[PDB]
Amino acid sequence: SNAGTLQEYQKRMKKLDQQYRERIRNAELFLQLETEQVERNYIKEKKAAVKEFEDKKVELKENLIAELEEKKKMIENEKLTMELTG
């Protein structure tokens, strides 16, 4: 009489529960995948930091080599200027 109505209700309650448990499960999985992405980003940033360090060190050394050659020339010009101006 009400048997079918009560039956539908219990079916639907069980589905709500299934959906709740699946939503919680998906949250747990999403947490793990998000955490992995955060870890990847960390690895990427450290690689970028090492590359920056290495690139800047190259630039500093190449600039030093050029500066030592330049100071040589300036020194020569100063010798000339001193010869010219007694």
Place this chain on the structure above:
Amino acid sequence: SNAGTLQEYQKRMKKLDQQYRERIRNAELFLQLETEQVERNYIKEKKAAVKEFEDKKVELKENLIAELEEKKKMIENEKLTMELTG
């Protein structure tokens, strides 16, 4: 003669190293803060899942109460129809 140039260079090399170490340190800290945010998001989602479950269960039960009252009325109408149509 080159002493000051070499001095500046060593100063700058030390600063590059300081900046590299700080960049790595900041990455480690950022990892921890990002990880905490991922954890907050997980907690938030589970709360939202519990609320959804509870809200849907209320709705299902309130609908059942209304449906049982409605079936009552339909049943009465069917009794009348049967009396009228022999």
